[PDB]
Amino acid sequence: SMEQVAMELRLTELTRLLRSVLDQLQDKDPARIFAQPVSLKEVPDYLDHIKHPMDFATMRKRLEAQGYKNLHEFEEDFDLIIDNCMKYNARDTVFYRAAVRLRDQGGVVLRQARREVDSIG
Numbered sequence: 001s002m003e004q005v006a007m008e009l010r011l012t013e014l015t016r017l018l019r020s021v022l023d024q025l026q027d028k029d030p031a032r033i034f035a036q037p038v039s040l041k042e043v044p045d046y047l048d049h050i051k052h053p054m055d056f057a058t059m060r061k062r063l064e065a066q067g068y069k070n071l072h073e074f075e076e077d078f079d080l081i082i083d084n085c086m087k088y089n090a091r092d093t094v095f096y097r098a099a100v101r102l103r104d105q106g107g108v109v110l111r112q113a114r115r116e117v118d119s120i121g
Helices: 002-027 056-064 071-088 094-120
Strands: none
Touching: 002 056, 002 071, 002 094, 056 071, 071 094
């Protein structure tokens, strides 16, 4: 149908905007701490601690399959990245500190993303 196509164009355009958001958030992680999944070879107990692992490569795979229906879903995944790190790692670690800085800096990006998603519809 023509309606299914219009819906699909909307999803494509959301995906475009989320790709730009993702790039901007990942720039706030210049150490690449959150770039890839935590390795279960190197942290074999990880899934005992963290039930829903997340990282920027995994988000990128979902995004490119147009697997985010709305900004809420995307933000859920970004908050997992941060929240998983802040639980597994202690306050005095470069990992925790990286997550705090990513959260604080990403907030600004996500605030305007929400306005753009609402504004453009």
